[PDB]
Amino acid sequence: STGSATTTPIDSLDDAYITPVQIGTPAQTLNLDFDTGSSDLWVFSSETTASEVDGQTIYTPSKSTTAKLLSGATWSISYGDGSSSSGDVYTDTVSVGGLTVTGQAVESAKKVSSSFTEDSTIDGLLGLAFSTLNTVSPTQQKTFFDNAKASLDSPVFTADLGYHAPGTYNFGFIDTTAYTGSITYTAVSTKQGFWEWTSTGYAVGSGTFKSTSIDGIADTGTTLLYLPATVVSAYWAQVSGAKSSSSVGGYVFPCSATLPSFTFGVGSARIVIPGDYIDFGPISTGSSSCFGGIQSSAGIGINIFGDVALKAAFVVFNGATTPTLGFASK
Template identity: 55%
Template sequence: MQPTTSFGTFLVTFLSASMAAGSAIPYMAPQPGSFEIKRAANNGFTGRNGALALARAYAKYGVPVTDTLLEAVETLKSAHLIKRSSGNVTATPDGDDLEYLVPVQIGTPPQTLNLDFDTGSSDLWVFSSETDTSSSQGHSVYSPSKSTSAQKLDGATWSITYGDQSSSSGDVYTDVVTLGSLTVKSQAVESAQQVSAQFAQGNNDGLLGLAFSSINTVKPTQQKTWFDNISGSLDSPLFVADLRHETPGSYIFGTIPSDASNVLYAPVDNSQGFWQFSTSSDIGGSFSAIADTGTTLLLASDDLVSAYYKNVQGAREDQQQGGYVFDCSTTLPDFTFTVGDGKITVPGSLINYGQASGSECFGGIQSSGGLPFAIFGDIALKAAYVVFDSGNTQVGWAQKK
């Protein structure tokens, strides 16, 4: 495949819509050492762009993004104009289920920025008063000079570069960071000085990484994630992703909700900094997978993907549309994978990601592009309560009914 570097010029331009409104989830009363961050449905949602979701994942993990895939993104962009709205103290879906933004308070007095929760990375970086104004236009920015608790980390720098060479970089401060009911008083906040086009054109004000601190990019001394800093104050050092399809969901810190019964656990291999675990399926054998809230689709080996769509009448791989497509009237089979001694099933209805061209729809299971692991993004995560348990270095899945 021939890579291209043009992806960054428009990637996040389209990350600006949400799932349709749905029924509310029950309220969880705040408890010492645990709290819930609710998501909010975005009434401005107009459609999903499967090719964009795939291209975004490829860029994140260093898989070449082809010109053909970019053309598919453009085609679907024309068909689905995407708009965005935001919620109130909620995690707001942004851009075709691509990002989940959470209002986070930074500094004294608090400055509120909408950050992307990402279990596939470990930096807390933000647009700031140090970012060039042409790049920060339209974003809320963190201003260290307006915070009485901000302290610059002398000599500390950070830099993130994705597979398409889009990047962000800058210097580092420590400051008060509050999420929900808990506060870290001296959290590393990575202030962006340089931001590439894909970030500048997006709607999020930065990113809050929830992978392991070992892949934090601050130099010369790596910094801990917000979760690693707060985990000792939680009732249990874990958080739960309760993501939903076309209804609100939430992130829960410090406790497992009572609805998450019969949790299946698998040990995590965090040697690469990810929430990576061993699994298997009847159609794909045994393989490793990463649980990643920052990826939309379920990406797997070519053999597994091909085996899945062999069971879908009329399904075909169409490079002009970005991946596997099928007639939208088709009822898709479920996808089942193992976790520990049990199994989790992703309903076929979740695997129908959205309309592609004409009467065809884009599949939520697509090729991982040769990566040595599968990526279980939101398509898979929505099927279960997913427990990210750092205390026991394990990931848990509890099937949703």
């Protein structure tokens, strides 16, 4: 079996991407944030504190003839940006782009933090990291991908995120028409539960490539590209007027700047992030100071190849016995 679903930026900045997901019988369609950096499928629901729901579409398990309460099961998660959510668990039928899993754990929010409430376009998350990170207690649950793996034509899913435009998540097959040249595969460590790999280095604009190992995670659920302070300083040093602002919380630059591209290495291959991808607009409405899309990972504890990087590539998440990551230009 295979599945294919269109993923869409939630706003003009590509702050995140939502993908429609069918839950329950009859189908309830929710727009979820597919997140290769986490492993919970959780949804706004009929159980969510009323004051914490504002515009999201909710999952009502009492209206699904296939929903079953997973007795005694709870969940609670906190994300790298300080947001959090928690609740109870049902199992139900979940379909993505024509691909169906029966008995998928659907984590029903009783509580969400303000940032989720404030984001009316995101109805929940669909985690695609390794099931070892799933927060369900006392019995950990498997991800949608993990549940579907055995039935897929090939044990893979691919992320093809768009720059200011729709893109695609495919399950079970590689669309050879969706990229240019070849896919370069690179090793993955699952030891922290992530799609963790090592980039072979970087270049800034038309500058020479620096060979250097950068360990980080492929994370569709993170907006920006977070890299070591040395790398990030080397990048922003090529932008006149750019500076790291404590008050704003990162590198800012004059909105009148033309940004250089950023290249990262995948083995001997190179992915070029166009400079326009690195512009995340005014720090506040009407400001002429713009927020940069490449930021320091210092104090995160890990480097994060988020959407800024991934959207410049066709990315294969290979869930074979020994998982690997593949990157192609597009």
